[PDB]
Amino acid sequence: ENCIFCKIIAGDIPSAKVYEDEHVLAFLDISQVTKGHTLVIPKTHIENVYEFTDELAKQYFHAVPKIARAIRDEFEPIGLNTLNNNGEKAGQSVFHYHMHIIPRYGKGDGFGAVWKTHADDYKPEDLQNISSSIAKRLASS
Template sequence: MGTTSACVFCGIIGGSDEDVVVYRDDVAVGFLDHSPLFVGHVLMVPATHVVTLADLPDDLVGPFYRRVQHVSARLPELLGAQGTFVANNNTVSQSVAHLHVHVVPRSKGDGLRGFFWPRRRYEPGQAVATAAELRRGLADFPHG
């Protein structure tokens, strides 16, 4: 497995954009989506290059999704949301060929309907500040 230099997400795993990383360990890396649905929209990726969910080795499925679960459980509290939307695409609509799970903070009346997902941009400095806040709030994952 490992990482590949042609993959933008492998670049982030390797440290190319550390300011937007909100979670990191030997299993998974979480970082802010550069074009989020809402502030705090996190992409969780395996720490090694895997293209689709079907490619994720069996022994990593549970550990990887426990980290997705942790981020999903914590985002509402950390961002003042009511819940989260969790999803991943495989090949079709997968903009980067590296398995990634979207963890999106949600609240009733937020305007997200069906599959119409208007993307936004962070204001200058907002992504870095949001990532720092989430890093602090997500640091308590029980490793081991």
């Protein structure tokens, strides 16, 4: 288990905790993209968002809103984002599911989303075929 997050859950590595219960553990990201940068992870070692089961999703997500409101009330930012990365090329460096809670203050934010639209590259029927394909795989969910 060469997972830095499992060692933080196990206490082997110190952390600045903000929230903790039976299945969830939240703590400040030492990178602090912005003041209040928090990491919310499940204690169960789940590699990515794909390995989530309904039962595990239930013991996890509820903490996100609570922690988000706590950060918003403490530092009253002008905005806030939640980000999850799955896969090296998606930005995931540690293979243990984690959600970033990033408060926004404006000028100086260490986080920003590059947004390149491509709406003119898809026709209504293409979108319908694409969605229809994803949906078919979901009939079993």
